[PDB]
Design a protein around this ligand. Structure first.
Ligand SMILES: O=c1ccn([C@@H]2O[C@H](COP(=O)(O)OP(=O)(O)O)[C@@H](O)[C@H]2O)c(=O)[nH]1
Ligand SMILES: O=c1ccn([C@@H]2O[C@H](COP(=O)(O)OP(=O)(O)O)[C@@H](O)[C@H]2O)c(=O)[nH]1
Ligand SMILES: O=c1ccn([C@@H]2O[C@H](COP(=O)(O)OP(=O)(O)O)[C@@H](O)[C@H]2O)c(=O)[nH]1
Ligand SMILES: O=c1ccn([C@@H]2O[C@H](COP(=O)(O)OP(=O)(O)O)[C@@H](O)[C@H]2O)c(=O)[nH]1
Lengths: 444, 443, 444, 436
């Protein structure tokens, strides 16, 4: 553990967990690692996860930063993660005192994409080689990467968007917010992509077989230094879960439902899947988030209904809250996965080879579904659209759930992805060799 | 894009730059604000500290200016004297600006520092912009000063500025016409170097000064950009609000004469006599000591105990810094008395307060004219120059009464208030221009 | 109430605290009433440790302590932990204003660190309090500091050397690059503070008139007229120290220390250790190897290895951590000092007439090394340059290490320095007399 | 107390002490007074006096000008001129001056200053009416004659001999001439002029200045003491009988050589006068002076230890002179001192070392205030014998007429000091003129 490295996730479970994963991974490869967190955390969950991680890994060290107050309405409405990410920039300078005192000077720092522009000054005064880890799809990341020239190019939204060395992305996959220049979200991505130039390398949670077209497209696309790190290894946070029912079930019989760290859909729609879930007869494990964005704000299982919970009393079990998704997904009993297609959830399923039913709700998740379908890892119906854009059928959903359980071709293809994913983590694997090579390059 | 703001001395110069800087930061530019020490007035120093603690990501660049060194520019004013001191030392900042870790894309300089600042970034890759504290109408007079000085052989009536109504000779300040005085030398020296500036920022909206903004555009300053009204950085802890809450809406008349303007000893007693005689409710900010806040160490021994007792029911007299923008927003204030320094004037317009115009020194008279033109307030030209003139209680009181009860003004003033709102809106020109400007900054 | 009250305000670091603590103790002896202003938390354990300990030793002196506020963006390029705190304290100096006004026994005067003189000066003015500056470094370096605004502003020239106005030219090669770069904190702090000196009633320098007559004049003639050499500051004062020395012959031991704040290159350390072995001189070696902070330098002998220690056990002993430097130099056994030539250590060596071999690492230190050579205190090799950026071979070091121990004229010269130092301390001596003179004005 | 005023003396206690008294006098008359001072001050005493003055008068504000980089006192007067602009910020921030009273030496520099910040300005002269005219008539005189004659005449003033006149003032080349001549020209700007004199002391002198175009001269003499109270010093003063003690002070600077000074020291014991002697070591500098009383010799101290006391350094002159014990004064004859003697009615012996003083001695003679020997001349020029001095010294103690003449002079001084008298009347009037 001669080399000293830090990783600095900003906000959100999707951002936070992987970086921890990168750190544990880095520690495993003889790196000395500090993990930087900024408080107060947006969600109760983020700290809960963080606390365990440090307890679980003593060798890795916690490096908190306390946030200063801010009040800017320029950011549209009130979504806390952009606000949290924005606040982090306001207090980012507070970082400098913290880095100056590090015992063995940091060889490199790994920084979440959202604040790559603020850190840059910090990265010139203290000359730290700075790296980034991408939580999104390489195909989706390819879109952001080419966004600035594409945003400069036109004023209206066309039928299909062409990123230069990649298959054109349908506009339906793209978020509205991305398209309009005036909107801030556009501002945050554009500036940050520019800051990539300063960075020594860019790391993404995907592997070359997995996104062959995109990774190369990125290569000639102005993102030369991108390294396919993924799939990010398990956090090894053992353990906090009781699953007597899961053990009883036959291997690959049970269906797992998670819509991500945040809730994805309306109750009326939600009841529709529950009704369709009954029609399918799949044994299930369902994790439900009452609060669409914050764990702290949810004190609501009223939404599914009284009759349904008793009706599926022996068919399935549901958790209202947080459960270990990878711990559950590695179980022999789980054979199908219905996800919101956040890239971390999609990547974990590919690593464990669990067939996916893609049900993207917002953001980059629609683009990840296209990768899920292109990979052959999962089944996706593009026509479902964004959440609340259309109300998709109980009867319609049931046919798709029945296909995932009884389509053997998906199982053979899903099995291949697990083998493809495993091979890249083997000593001869490009992903393991790239991580090992990057660690070798870090200076004393 | 890194932008640096270089305000000169004075809360009139200081307040606008910080306000914009906060606006720039809100809209996402990396912002640095340049301050130098010492500062003439306590408020500027106290304010800067407050502003930075409220806005953490804005960098503070502090330089100690060289000791006052001079020859020429007859100056009897402390704030103007400090401006000369900042201007003579701006050329020593070239070494510091060259090595800044996040290099500046552009500098937004103060009008007074524009000539020295333009020379400073000549061989550096930094765009030079200037923010104008005053009104657009005054800028037309500034542009015409060389023509005004050359063909000004006769002391008669007013001079017709080329694209708008002629200004009375009484409105032009006598100091502006004397080349020896600092006010004239600085105005002339800066206008000559305005052509080396990428853009000139102004605190007026297109609705407020359509003729003045248009006249300057065709008069050689073709890069003018209206961004007004500037928005408050809304940072404040001390509350002096309580008396007002007791007051009925619109009853109170607010009197203030800016950061560094004081009345005559005969005028303070005649103004006080008028406030009693009028019978109006009022809020008085008393700045008897003079410009500097530190030396104005007196504490209401200007009027005496007898007067406070008589007026306590209808008035509160405060000596010290008051949160002007907040007071103006209050339901209670239905009148304002102003020296018509532009920043007060803009605030009156944004918050729709009827204004009673009372110039004491410099641009105030022209701005007073603008205020009258737009219906914002009533101006009495005959009163002429405060500090050169004395007005009796009878005259003052009647005007005070008249402004409070002009419903046409209250209706008229509101209309300006609406227009100021529109411009800030995304459609509205002033915000749009800044949004237009901000993109430009990215290079 | 009818008694002078003097407050001392030190900055970050052992070098800046200790001179202040020592003076505070010196003043207390001479009947002054002393208060020390301290900010928590300390950058390093040692400063914390001394303060609690120091106040135990001198109960009468008041300890006035303040909280360290968050770091601010004032545009400096500092990557150092001790400099950054210096920055952090200064931003918050204005906050003290209400408190100084309200003290039970009021302040009559205060003395500021150079770093806080510009900020400190402003607070006093609304109070009837005299202001003084106590300066950590040498007169000769001080000569440079005053020049700095003039030097930065115009010449902008990379000549071989430049000349300070009433003092001989100083080689550029012996001037740190960072002093030259305006954006950097080191240049910026020196310049802003120097400019504010006109305000201070006097500037106190820990050097004596015999030691730097030429510099003292050079500064005086340059118009910061009020200069008050007080050197050398007296130990304020048993402990769990080393008895290894008590068993060593006199003059047989060579002491190596680079101060509290200097780490060394691992290459540098390996070569330096090897050099001692060839030289064969008995030695005491202190490793501030690790970080500037004692808290984060957890490295033990993992830096030198096991074999080096056993081989050298007869020859010398190496310790990592705080050592009681004053006591060690005082010991009859120590025959030579290898020092980075920081002023506090340089002055101490002069006090005890210990021959110095000069190896300046950063900042003020090269200018300091030269005077050390000049006064006949020590041997300095110019070609070695800066410790931080250049590495010196073991053999060259060993050959030099021998020379200082073997040269006996230097031992005679160092003694000459010592006698002079003794002369000032005495009631006859100008420095003691100057301090007594200073006290009487304090007592108005 | 409405009016607000400021004083500015550049250097010497010759000017500062009078100015401060002017400052105190003005405060008494209901004026807000600000005193402007130059730093660093040339003398530790000059600095010493200022701190005391503000401390003694709480309500008098102090404003200072820090200074940017022959006689120290003259050169510094030159330096203040360099930094005069520094004044500009100070005036601008003032809580504005109804008028400023400024030192004669730097009046020329300020003329520009007065005109931009409109301030009526005045100057106060610390030299005699007879001497001021010599300065006053000097500019014409230099160009017109360019020669050396035994005596020189100022239009309505009885000619005083060259022997009195200082040599340097005579030379056109010299720095001193430029300052004096230039400044008088600047004298035109001021709305008043003040000298520490009263008409009675020099009716002839005051008139000539009125005649000679110094129409605006105002004599406000004598200036009231600004003083500390109360210190139990000089138990050696209270002990002695009235008018038994001779007090010797050659200046606010040294004036004669150790051997020349030894002759008076030997003359003092032969004279038999009891004495309090103020002996300054530094020829011109208090900080420079670091010599003990070894110029007089150990022997002198043992012999006279009961008879008289020697103070090395400074003392409060007005305080000492006012004492019953003092009956004789020996003076270098600096005007400020001479005026103090007349107001306190203490007989003087005149021994002027340098400069304006010899002319000042002449005034004392016309007055009858003291006994003077002209032949003794410029200090250190010639050696004056111990035997010769005593006869004059004894004569000062035992002359009845002198006591009478001196008694009147004190009486005359008061009448102007009182409300009816002109010096008081003008002060009242000038303040009245002062406009808020
Ligand atoms: O109950 C839950 C919900 C989510 N996750 C983890 O949350 C991470 C982030 O999910 P993703 O990136 O797919 O989407 P997000 O929640 O950020 O929208 C993934 O590692 C999931 O395994 C989990 O472990 N348990
Ligand atoms: O007691 C005061 C006086 C002034 N101001 C602020 O100072 C600003 C600038 O004043 P202006 O430019 O109107 O006049 P000036 O001070 O420049 O002569 C105004 O917006 C006021 O809000 C204030 O807050 N409190
Ligand atoms: O192990 C150590 C190291 C340093 N010092 C003392 O710390 C003071 C400050 O050191 P200096 O200024 O010489 O160097 P710096 O620590 O600032 O680099 C000196 O008195 C040293 O004797 C000490 O007592 N023990
Ligand atoms: O020991 C001394 C000597 C002088 N003076 C004062 O010196 C002032 C001015 O002295 P003068 O101008 O007459 O003499 P000079 O300064 O020219 O030598 C008078 O007010 C004296 O009271 C004093 O107070 N103490």
């Amino acid at each position: 553990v001669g080399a000293h490295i830090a990783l600095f996730p900003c906000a959100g479970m999707g951002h936070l967990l992987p970086f921890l994963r990168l750190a544990a991974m880095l520690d495993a490869r003889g790196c000395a690692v500090t993990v930087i967190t900024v408080k107060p955390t947006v969600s109760a969950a983020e700290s809960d996860h963080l606390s365990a991680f440090f307890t679980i890994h003593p060798r890795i060290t916690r490096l908190e930063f306390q946030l200063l107050p801010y009040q800017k309405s320029g950011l549209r409405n009130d979504d806390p993660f952009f606000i949290q990410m924005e606040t982090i920039a306001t207090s980012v300078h507070l970082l400098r005192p913290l880095l100056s005192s590090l015992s063995p000077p940091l060889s490199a720092i790994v920084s979440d994409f959202t604040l790559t522009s603020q850190v840059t000054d910090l990265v010139s005064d203290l000359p730290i080689s700075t790296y980034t880890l991408m939580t999104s799809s390489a195909a989706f990341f390819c879109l952001m990467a080419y966004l600035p020239k594409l945003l400069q190019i036109d004023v209206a939204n066309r039928d299909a968007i062409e990123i230069p060395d990649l298959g054109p992305i349908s506009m339906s996959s793209i978020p509205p917010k991305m398209l309009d220049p005036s909107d801030f979200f556009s501002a945050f991505i554009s500036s940050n992509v520019s800051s990539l130039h300063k960075v020594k390398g860019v790391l993404i949670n995907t592997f070359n077989s997995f996104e062959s077209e995109a990774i190369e497209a990125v290569r000639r696309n102005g993102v030369d230094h991108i390294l396919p790190i993924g799939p990010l290894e398990s956090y090894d946070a053992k353990k906090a879960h009781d699953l007597p029912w899961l053990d009883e079930q036959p291997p690959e019989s049970v269906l797992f439902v998670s819509f991500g760290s945040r809730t994805a859909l309306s109750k009326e729609q939600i009841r529709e899947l529950g009704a369709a879930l009954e029609k399918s007869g799949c044994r299930f494990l369902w994790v439900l988030k009452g609060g669409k964005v914050d764990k702290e704000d949810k004190e609501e299982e009223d939404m599914l209904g009284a009759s349904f919970v008793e009706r599926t009393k022996k068919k399935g079990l549901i958790v209202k809250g947080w459960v270990k998704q990878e711990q559950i997904l590695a179980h022999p009993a789980i054979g199908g996965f219905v996800s919101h297609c956040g890239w971390n959830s999609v990547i974990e399923a590919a690593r464990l080879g669990v067939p996916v039913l893609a049900w993207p709700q917002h953001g980059d998740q629609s683009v990840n579904a296209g990768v899920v379908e292109k990979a052959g890892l999962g089944l996706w119906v593009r026509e479902w659209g964004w959440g609340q854009t259309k109300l998709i059928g109980r009867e319609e959903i049931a046919e798709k759930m029945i296909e995932v359980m009884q389509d053997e071709k998906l199982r053979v293809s899903a099995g291949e992805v697990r083998a493809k994913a495993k091979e890249t983590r083997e000593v001869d694997g490009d992903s393991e060799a790239l991580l090992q090579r990057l660690i070798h390059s870090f200076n004393n």
